[PDB]
Symmetry: C2
């Protein structure tokens, strides 16, 4: 099975990938925001939306990945090995969850169509050579 967590939401991992990694806030800040804005909806007995369903699982999944990453960390004696793992995470699952959390949280905040529009827009912008390609990259906004 090849499942792309974005696809039922109108995007793909490639679409998210156009964005530079430093575009995304830390996982810690994203989780703080999810709490501050959607905690009750997230904890309630209603589906609310497919983003909430998706988000609920991502939040818990990240708790299992940190437990595993902390465990590996304590089981490595060599500080260079630890550093290797942390870099690997940061650049792989860690960025993956930054992207995924940012996406669902932004869809909830701005609306799914607005985020998808922005991602397409940014993807064509970033990929237009410097010469052309206006000075102002696209904006993400409630309007």
């Amino acid at each position: 099975m090849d499942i792309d967590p974005y696809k039922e939401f109108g995007a793909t991992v490639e679409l998210l990938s156009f964005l530079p990694s430093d575009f995304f806030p830390s996982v810690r800040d994203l989780l703080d925001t999810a709490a501050a804005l959607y905690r009750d909806a997230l904890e309630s007995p209603e589906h609310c939306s497919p983003h909430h369903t998706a988000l609920r699982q991502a939040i818990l999944c990240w708790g299992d990945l940190m437990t595993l990453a902390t465990w590996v960390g304590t089981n490595l004696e060599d500080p260079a090995s630890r550093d290797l793992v942390v870099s690997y995470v940061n650049t792989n699952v860690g960025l993956k969850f930054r992207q995924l959390l940012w996406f669902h949280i932004s869809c909830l905040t701005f609306g799914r169509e607005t985020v998808l529009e922005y991602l397409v827009s940014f993807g064509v912008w970033i990929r237009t050579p410097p010469a052309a390609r206006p000075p102002n990259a696209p904006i993400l906004s409630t309007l």
Copy 2:
């Protein structure tokens, strides 16, 4: 926060962890079942349902844990211990994923409300002294 992944589905962690562990098939069996019965729905662009969405996340989460655990194994252990971290994962959180995968795959196959009454009835069964519980433990079948 405190999120119970079953609550939007009318269940709780407890309703599940209440059944015996031996009850839940292994992760590998559930994943193969999900592919065999639902691969197309799962890889498709429609939500299909809240169970499909939840099932996709669950499957991708286990895959994230496995990718992380395998990479550590292969690249930071001697070859003979390549599976060390995978094993730690299976032992530490294997059961909790087996319940989650079994619950959505089952609600997809039998319908949620049918799964719920099976869970409720197993708990009622088991909480009855083995004398009015006709060994007919209830089963999820047909």
